[PDB]
Amino acid sequence: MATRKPAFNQHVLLDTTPLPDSIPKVKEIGASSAPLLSASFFIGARCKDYNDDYMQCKNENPGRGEFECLKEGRRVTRCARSVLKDINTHCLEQFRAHWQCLDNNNQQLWQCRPAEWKLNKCVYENLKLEKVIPDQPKNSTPVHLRQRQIFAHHAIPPWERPFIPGQ
């Protein structure tokens, strides 16, 4: 269906026909927006190559990327699933803290820095997956590692510190 923004939808159309058996099956990711968002940089850390490969596959086949990239689509779902399996087996309490804060704070990452710093540390010490943001200004501290947040509704306490690996 079209990517147009609807303005007068009053109905939803579903189709129960499954995929043909010739296509290998896959378990869809069963994580909501807020957990996906707390785990996005972790998914980016592990699956960046497969994510890039999938997107490059589609760009190689313009107008045909839905089909004939399915096998690469399946890899991206399995890799992301491995990060949400590993996090849920090693950082569950800290994971739930961050995504529950995110869900309560308009999904704004700068509103939950103490919960993020706790999860960032735990994830790094069990999964060796580290958060990275390309091209942040080298003349300033990275915004996600700043002790004070200007746009934060509640001030970050001074006993909650950013997680810098190697310290």
Partner 1 sequence: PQDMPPPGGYEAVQYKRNLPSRGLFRPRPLLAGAAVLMLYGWYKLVKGIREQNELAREKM
DSSP conformation letters of 79-141:
HHHHHHHHHHHHSHHHHHHHHHHHHHTTT-GGG-HHHHHHHHHHHHHHH------TT--TTS-
Q: Would you say 92 or 133 has its CB closer to partner 1?
A: 133
The C-alpha angle 95, 101, 104, rounded to 5 degrees, equals: 140
Q: Would you say 69 or 129 has its CB closer to partner 1?
A: 129
Q: Would you say 51 or 110 has its CB closer to partner 1?
A: 110
Q: Would you say 26 or 36 has its CB closer to partner 1?
A: 36
Residues that bind partner 1 (CB under 8 A): 109-110, 133, 135-137, 140, 142-144, 146, 149-151
CB of 109 to partner 1, least distance (A): 6
Distance in angstroms (rounded) separating the CA atoms of residues 92 and 98: 10
CB of 25 to partner 1, least distance (A): 33
Length reported for the chain: 167
CB of 116 to partner 1, least distance (A): 10
CB of 159 to partner 1, least distance (A): 22
Distance in angstroms (rounded) separating the CA atoms of residues 161 and 120: 12
